[PDB]
From a paper:
To elucidate the impact of antitumor splicing modulators on the splicing pathway and reveal how the U2 snRNP accurately selects and binds the introns, we set out to obtain the cryo-EM structure of a prespliceosome arrested by SSA. We designed a model RNA substrate consisting of 54 intron nucleotides, the second MINX exon, the downstream 5′SS, and three MS2 aptamers for affinity purification. Single-particle cryo-EM analysis of A3′-SSA enabled the reconstruction of a ~12 Å density map that corresponds to the U2 snRNP module of the complex. Focused classification and refinement enabled us to resolve the U2 5′ module to a resolution of ~3.1 Å. In this map, we modeled the SF3B complex, the two matrin-type zinc-finger domains of SF3A2 and SF3A3, part of the intron substrate paired to the U2 snRNA, and the SSA ligand used to arrest the splicing reaction. SSA has an elongated, L-shaped density and is positioned in the hinged pocket of SF3B, between its SF3B1 and PHF5A subunits. Equally unexpected, U2 pairs with the intron, despite SSA having bound to the open state of SF3B. The structure of the A3′-SSA captures an E-to-A intermediate, indicating how the U2/intron duplex forms in at least two steps. The structure of A3′-SSA shows that SSA’s binding to the hinged pocket allows the initial U2-intron pairing in the form of the precursor duplex while preventing its further extension. The A3′-SSA structure reveals that FR901464 analogs, such as SSA or SD6, act at the latest stages of intron selection by the U2 snRNP by “locking” the SF3B1 subunit in an open state and preventing the formation of the extended U2/intron duplex.
Splicing modulators alter the splicing patterns in cells by binding to the U2 snRNP (small nuclear ribonucleoprotein)—a complex chaperoning the selection of branch and 3′ splice sites. The U2 snRNP has a bipartite organization, exhibiting a smaller U2 3′ module and a larger U2 5′ module. The latter contains the heptameric SF3B complex, whose core subunit SF3B1 is recurrently mutated in cancers. In this work, by employing FR901464 analogs as molecular tools to dissect the splicing pathway, we elucidate how spliceostatins/sudemycins interfere with prespliceosome assembly and splicing commitment by covalent coupling to a reactive zinc finger of PHF5A.
Numbering used by the authors:
A (entry chain C): 1016 to 1304
B (entry chain D): 9 to 89
C (entry chain A): 887 to 1067, 1074 to 1217
D (entry chain N): 387 to 483
E (entry chain I): 458 to 533, 566 to 602, 605 to 664, 680 to 687
F (entry chain K): 12 to 45, 55 to 88
G (entry chain M): 41 to 87
H (entry chain F): 160 to 180
Write the structure that this text describes.
RNA sequence: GAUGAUGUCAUACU
RNA sequence: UAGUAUCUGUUCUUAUCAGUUUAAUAUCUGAU
């Protein structure tokens, strides 16, 4: 039945595509015994391109079916093919490959993906490292809460990437930090994110718009995950810094924190003493029964 | 580039090209909260149109899970002008 | 205006129980302008049934926290942490520390360590040596918390509350050298001590907590952290005894966050992460709404847990009955 | 200007056109702000603070005048003696009941 | 209108955090007071630099990537070994406190660094064999630590021949609440 | 001088090796490798004790001439 | 080449430790070698 | 190569998934 | 160390209390706000006792609470302004003994903020319109009506905003069957912000403001 | 920028702390238990406390400074 | 030990 | 397609103050 279904995947009509992909997915879910691994790899290769379809139903079916196949067959061979694709593409379908890696991580277990993914990161070709970082960013954004047991595992690579000389690395690593912090929000990963915050913070004076944009997105995700009090603690020194550029940056960050966390900041403002003209002490909070 | 007026009872829509996309952050992962738009952006011939391109709407627009976590669904009508 | 009270013995005096009452003199709250302070001492005569006025030691600030300490007493006079000993006509200041930031509101004591609550800053750990009579600050926590009260769990872990309606639990990390001892060259990490206390729990109650206690309400159960709130409510915090129970209740709380949203439209996760993010607690106020939820929604929630809704209700009642009720 | 003459853009970029005088270094003139903040931990300012009886901690960085340095040292020593708890405890100074 | 840095250090109660540029702010007293706030991590230094915070880290070569030891122990075909690596040997890496930012020379600075016993390579460079002996495994600097008494900066360490016995020197020298199980 | 300059130590001896060698006499607050080296300890008396102790330490035929 | 200053970093480019410089390919490094900076740095290292 | 051991790797993955469940 | 939170006794202090026919019958019931807990109480007319019919933990600060009844209707709905940034209209179902979220209109960010409304709440006595309002700058009017199926329809919020203005208290005006009017006490703090002499704060007098709402013209006029 | 209480590189200390105090007062009037605490400290009704905080909203830090 | 700024270069990546 | 980055080349009196501006330089404008 299945080899007969294999040539139908290149049909251009969305109904045939959706139905055949769903059929292949159910076959891979509950009856993959009777099909060899090579045929499933062929199906995966044909399926990879359909992740960028305009119709959301075919994309959803493709995600489900790729997940079923990845759950059915081992992770190693399909993951090896995907990492090979990741290194040899450097084009638009690389993000397709990135989505497929995330699907494998969400459907199968991520401890079957992270070792091989990080060992491939040691090759010094740079563009492969940017691909690994983008794959990690989308992987964490896609798996969400499931990533809570893998923050420590990817913490050293992120330390390396956030301090690397290449600024594209900093931007994509900040994207990883944002997706991570938003995915593990409320599950006790405050210390690892605080550590990564110490590497994300010094890039707030970067001039490239896509980079400072990624930094601000990382800072907003970190405001959600670690809390506004820590972000305000990082902010208070430069709010009235002599340099106007420092004041611009830090007041932008303060504006983001304040818009996101106005009522919480009440508990986090520093003690500002009175002077000879004005009263700056919030005396009500100094009441003790 | 965002309208950012006070949203009302009108439900934002997406076209067939962007079905499932988050209007704030462009992510396709985990839609969460239904999009509401201002009344002016849904008035007259504008009803049911895509909140990104103004073309025909075929599905309901959603904020992604990350945007609702960061309360980016409370900033006003996200119709792009 | 009395603001603190304690009962203690003394080393120079015999088995008499002394009641020390801290009193602010002519304190105006807004703006804050205190005219001094006093500490009354009473001998608690007639077997805990009568107070006799023995003496009254004047102090400069409000003695807002009085605590017994190794046969002597600890008084928080404003931002001053004073080890006092009972004298004949007054109280003898035997030691003093003044590295406390703003204003002492509470003093805890277990072993040699003294845990001091600031009115705005967090808990400060003080190592007291009986030799050399020194109150050496060796640890603190890196969050401004308007702490109402504190409590002790063991030698390393301190629970505490907030003026805004939060409960935090902080713990000293392992292998911290407590035998620390010029002051100009030596500096802390960030305007404090060289060692910092990590937070291992944070949870927004929503109603301001003014009392915490590690007790056991029913005999034969197990110890738990009881808090009482200013809105009239009493709650409890229960440690998890296994990984599988924690995983199950985590999944139950995750499902009841989505399939049973709160009535006012507030996100429950963001409500419990109001001032500081939620950490290492599972809110059973939402998990106990599983029994009041609709039965089709009950089995729809419980089918992902691979358990019947009677089994989920049995586990929810078992975590309430194996601890205090 | 070391050995061969430095380029004039290097001269303007480092800030060597602006000179700072330190009285603690015997009215020494330092060219460039980075070298001026570099000399405060160096041996010359350390010896100048040794001649003034000042331990030369980080409190006295960016301090040039002699009178300002000794006034800062007096204030710092006063607040350090206030912060330190000298053994001035009381032991029954009114021996009556 | 601007006062001097010495005048600002005189007026404020925290003259340690006052820099040269702090007098040029719109409100210098509020600036030094906010720098005297407790848990505020320092502003990154490269606001005053001119090299974009990492463009100087060029010539010092680095290893390409180090792996965590639990993953490295897998030889990266048995996925149970990988489950054990990610769930039974997954040690927490050395994290940092919130007050410790990053700069150019942070990687190459070695403040992370055990008194009374040097390393095996350090003892080999000092001409000392590694072992439990009390004749050559203590350093030659410990000979002065026996002659002139123990060093005052290590009071809890007992020197062999001065504060520790020679045959006893084999290296030349509350329960938690709420825990699971 | 709270920082002791150790001359006679070649560049083959590592800065962590020098920090570990001076670490026995006391906790080295700072280290610098200029040929020679510099080690700044917590206290001046600890630095003087380290200079008196490690002066006879002829590490690989090189004495650590430590002076304030 | 055989010079110790030329190296391949962890990033796929080529780096001259003598000049603290990054070059995309071999031709950029050889054009840098004929430049003023590399000649002056070799003259400084000649002493 | 990997193609000869692909069936063995798939069998090992199925055995691991049976043992994990 | 992982913990688990429980509530042995809920909060018992009362922030707000309203009365009306929330069960739809002839007897009147009280809705009280215990802070983060909304309770429905039944004062018995015979024995004189008070029975707590329902307690619901709403997991948020209830900053305002006011009940309204539509024209000709026999049931009272509960309008809840909270720290969620949403205005929630609830109806008590006596059959299931629970509160049903009839309406939940999102207008602002979450938290007790200075300009996101929820602190102040007003209804029209005929139940035609409600007005949620913050302390500062921001008043929203929701016009409420019915369809043919006797349900509740809430309109889009009509902005009656006025920057640099403090709201002391808002309430509806029983004008009758005319255009619904809302009464506010307002302070104009803009003159005292830019006056360093301090004389403006001594002369910043309060304003009683009547905001009329024309239902046909669909806008709010001062 | 249109949200009251936000700031910029030219924000003065007086305006920043006035924003802080007004935000704090509105937060007290929102959070029932904060106002409860404040009404237990003094011996005033909750309505009186609300009135006092509202009167404080006009100039919570006093008149501003020149320049 | 402080490497910035610019273009006629020339070379790489989007 | 037109944006960025990296090499090469250039990078402005070892003669003095004031003003705009700058965190400070730098730049620009006048006088010796
Ligand atoms: C509104 C638009 O911006 C208009 C237009 C013309 O913009 C250029 O077209 C946009 C559509 C872009 C599409 C469809 C891009 C394809 C992308 O493919 C990559 C691989 C990503 N794929 C996924 O994330 C796939 C699956 C996910 C995990 O699951 C689901 C259910 O989505 C993202 C894009 C789809 C249009 O938006
Ligand atoms: Zn709009
Ligand atoms: Zn569209
Ligand atoms: Zn989004
Ligand atoms: Zn000097
Ligand atoms: Zn070179």
């Amino acid at each position: 039945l299945l080899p007969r279904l294999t040539p139908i995947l290149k049909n251009r009509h969305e109904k045939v595509q959706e139905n055949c992909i769903d059929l292949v997915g159910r076959i891979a879910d509950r009856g993959a015994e009777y099909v060899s691994a090579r045929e499933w790899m062929r199906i995966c290769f044909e399926l990879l391109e359909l992740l960028k379809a305009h119709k959301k139903a075919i994309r959803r079916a493709t995600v489900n079916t790729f997940g079923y196949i990845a759950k059915a067959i081992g992770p190693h061979d399909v993951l090896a093919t995907l990492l090979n694709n990741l290194k040899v593409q450097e084009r638009q379908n690389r993000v397709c490959t990135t989505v497929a890696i995330a699907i494998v991580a969400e459907t199968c277990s991520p401890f079957t993906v992270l070792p091989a993914l990080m060992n491939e990161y040691r090759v010094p070709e740079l563009n492969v490292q940017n691909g690994v970082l983008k794959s990690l960013s989308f992987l964490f954004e896609y798996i969400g809460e499931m990533g809570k047991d893998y923050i420590y595992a990817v913490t050293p690579l992120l330390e390396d990437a956030l301090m690397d000389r290449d600024l594209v690395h900093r931007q994509t690593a900040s994207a990883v930090v944002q997706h991570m912090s938003l995915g593990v929000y409320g599950f006790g990963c405050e210390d690892s994110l605080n550590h990564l915050l110490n590497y994300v913070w010094p890039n707030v004076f970067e001039t490239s718009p896509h980079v400072i944009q990624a930094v601000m997105g990382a800072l907003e995700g970190l405001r959600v995950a670690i809390g506004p009090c820590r972000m305000l603690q990082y902010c208070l020194q430069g709010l009235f810094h002599p340099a106007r550029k420092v004041r611009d940056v830090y007041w932008k960050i303060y504006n983001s924190i304040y818009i996101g966390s106005q009522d919480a900041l009440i508990a986090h403002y520093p003690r500002i003493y009175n002077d000879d003209k004005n009263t700056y002490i919030r005396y009500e909070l100094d009441y003790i029964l | 580039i965002f309208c950012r007026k006070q949203a009302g009872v009108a439900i934002g829509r997406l076209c067939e090209k962007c079905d499932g996309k988050c209007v704030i952050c462009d992510s396709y992962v985990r839609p969460c909260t239904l999009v509401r738009i201002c009344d002016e952006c849904n008035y007259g011939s504008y009803q049911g149109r895509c909140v990104i391109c103004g073309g025909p709407g075929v599905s309901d627009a959603y904020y992604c899970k990350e945007c609702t976590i960061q309360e980016k669904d409370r900033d006003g009508c996200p119709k792009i002008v | 205006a009395a603001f603190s009270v304690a009962v203690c013995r003394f080393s120079n005096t015999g088995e008499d129980w002394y009641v020390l009452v801290g009193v602010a003199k002519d304190l105006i709250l807004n703006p804050r302008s205190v005219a001094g302070g006093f500490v009354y001492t009473y001998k608690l005569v007639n077997n805990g049934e009568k107070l006799e006025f023995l003496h009254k030691t004047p102090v400069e600030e409000v003695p807002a926290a009085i605590a017994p300490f190794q046969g002597r007493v600890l008084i928080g006079v404003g931002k001053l942490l004073r080890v006092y000993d009972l004298g004949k006509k007054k109280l003898l200041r035997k030691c003093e520390n003044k590295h406390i930031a703003n204003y002492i509101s509470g003093i805890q004591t277990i072993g040699h360590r003294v845990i001091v609550s600031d009115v705005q800053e967090s808990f400060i750990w003080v190592r007291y040596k009986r030799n050399e009579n020194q109150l050496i600050i060796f640890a603190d926590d890196t969050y401004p918390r308007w702490v109402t009260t504190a409590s002790l769990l063991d030698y390393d872990t301190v629970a505490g509350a907030d003026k805004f309606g939060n409960i935090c639990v902080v713990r000293l990390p392992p292998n911290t050298n407590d035998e620390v001892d010029k002051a100009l060259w030596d500096r802390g990490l960030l305007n404090g001590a060289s060692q910092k206390a990590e937070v291992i729990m944070n949870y927004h109650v929503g109603e301001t907590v003014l009392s915490l206690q590690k007790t056991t309400l029913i005999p034969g159960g197990s110890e738990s952290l009881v808090y009482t709130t200013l809105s009239g409510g009493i709650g409890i915090l229960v440690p998890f005894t296994s990984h599988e129970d924690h995983d199950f209740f985590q999944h139950v709380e995750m499902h009841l966050r989505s399939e049973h949203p709160p009535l006012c439209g507030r996100d429950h996760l963001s409500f419990r992460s109001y001032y500081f993010p939620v950490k290492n607690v599972i809110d059973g106020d939402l998990c106990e709404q599983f029994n009041s939820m609709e039965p089709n929604k009950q089995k729809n929630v419980s089918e992902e847990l691979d358990r019947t809704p009677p089994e989920v209700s049995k586990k929810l009642e078992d975590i309430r009955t194996r601890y205090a009720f | 200007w070391d050995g061969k003459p430095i380029p004039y853009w290097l001269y303007k970029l480092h800030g060597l056109n602006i000179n700072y005088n330190c009285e603690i270094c015997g009215n020494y003139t330092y060219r460039g702000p980075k070298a001026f903040q570099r000399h405060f931990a160096e041996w010359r300012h350390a010896h100048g603070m040794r001649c003034l009886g000042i331990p030369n901690t980080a409190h006295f960085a960016n301090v040039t005048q002699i009178e300002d340095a000794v006034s800062l040292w007096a204030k710092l020593k006063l607040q350090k003696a206030s912060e330190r708890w000298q053994p001035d405890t009381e032991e029954e100074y009114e021996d009556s009941s | 209108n601007r006062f001097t840095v010495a005048e600002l250090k005189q007026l404020v109660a925290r003259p340690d955090v006052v820099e040269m540029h702090d007098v040029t702010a719109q409100d210098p007293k509020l600036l030094v007071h906010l720098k005297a706030t407790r848990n505020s991590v320092p502003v990154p230094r490269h606001w005053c630099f001119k090299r974009k915070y990492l463009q100087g880290k060029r010539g010092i070569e680095k290893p390409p990537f180090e792996l965590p030891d639990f993953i490295k122990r897998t030889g990266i075909i048995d996925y149970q070994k990988l489950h054990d690596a990610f769930f039974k040997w997954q040690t927490k890496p050395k994290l940092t406190i919130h007050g410790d930012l990053y700069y150019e020379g942070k990687e190459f600075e070695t403040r992370l660094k055990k008194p009374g016993d040097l390393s095996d390579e350090l003892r080999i460079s000092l001409g000392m064999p590694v072992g439990p002996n009390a004749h050559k495994v203590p350093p030659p600097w410990l000979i002065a630590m026996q002659r002139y008494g123990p060093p005052p900066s290590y009071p809890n360490l007992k020197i062999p021949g001065l504060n520790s016995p020679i045959p006893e020197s084999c290296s030349f020298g509350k329960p938690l609440y709420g825990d699971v199980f | 001088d709270a920082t002791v300059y150790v001359g006679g130590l070649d560049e083959k001896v590592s800065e962590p090796l020098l920090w570990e060698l001076f670490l026995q006499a006391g906790p080295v607050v700072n280290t610098h490798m200029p040929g020679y080296g510099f080690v700044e300890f917590l206290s001046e008396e600890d630095a003087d004790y380290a200079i008196k102790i490690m002066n006879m330490i002829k590490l690989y035929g090189k004495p650590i001439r430590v002076n304030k | 080449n055989k010079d110790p200053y030329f190296m391949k970093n962890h990033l796929g480019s080529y780096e001259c430790k003598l000049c603290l410089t990054l070059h995309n390919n071999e031709g950029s490094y050889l054009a840098h070698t004929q430049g003023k900076k590399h000649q002056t740095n070799l003259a400084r290292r000649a002493a | 190569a990997a193609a000869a051991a692909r069936a063995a790797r798939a069998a090992a993955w199925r055995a691991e998934q049976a043992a994990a469940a | 160390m992982f913990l688990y939170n429980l509530t042995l006794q809920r909060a018992t202090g009362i922030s707000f209390a309203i009365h009306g026919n929330f069960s739809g019958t002839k007897q009147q019931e009280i809705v009280v706000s215990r802070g983060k807990i909304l309770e429905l109480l039944r004062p018995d007319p015979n024995t004189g006792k008070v029975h707590t019919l329902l307690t619901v933990e709403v997991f948020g600060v209830i900053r305002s609470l006011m009940a309204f009844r539509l024209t000709g209707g026999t049931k009272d709905y509960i309008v809840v302004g909270s720290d969620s940034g949403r205005i929630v209209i609830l109806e008590y179902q006596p059959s299931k003994n629970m509160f049903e979220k009839i309406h939940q209109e999102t207008f602002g960010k979450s938290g007790c903020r200075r300009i996101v409304p929820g602190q102040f709440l007003a209804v029209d006595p005929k139940g035609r319109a409600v007005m949620i309002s913050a302390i500062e700058k921001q008043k929203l009017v929701y016009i409420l009506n019915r369809d043919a199926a006797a349900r509740l329809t809430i309109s889009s919020p009509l902005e009656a905003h006025k920057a640099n203005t403090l709201v002391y208290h808002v309430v509806g005006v029983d004008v009758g069957f005319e255009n619904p009017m809302f009464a506010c006490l307002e302070m104009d703090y803009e003159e005292a912000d830019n006056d360093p002499t301090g004389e403006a704060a001594a002369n910043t007098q309060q304003t009683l403001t009547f905001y009329e709402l024309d239902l046909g013209l669909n806008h709010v006029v001062r | 920028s249109k949200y009251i209480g936000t700031g910029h590189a030219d924000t003065t200390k007086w305006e920043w702390l006035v924003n802080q105090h007004r935000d704090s007062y509105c937060s007290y009037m929102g959070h029932f238990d904060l106002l409860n605490y404040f009404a237990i400290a003094e011996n005033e009704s909750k309505a009186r406390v609300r009135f006092n905080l509202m009167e404080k909203m006009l100039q919570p830090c006093g008149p501003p400074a020149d320049k």
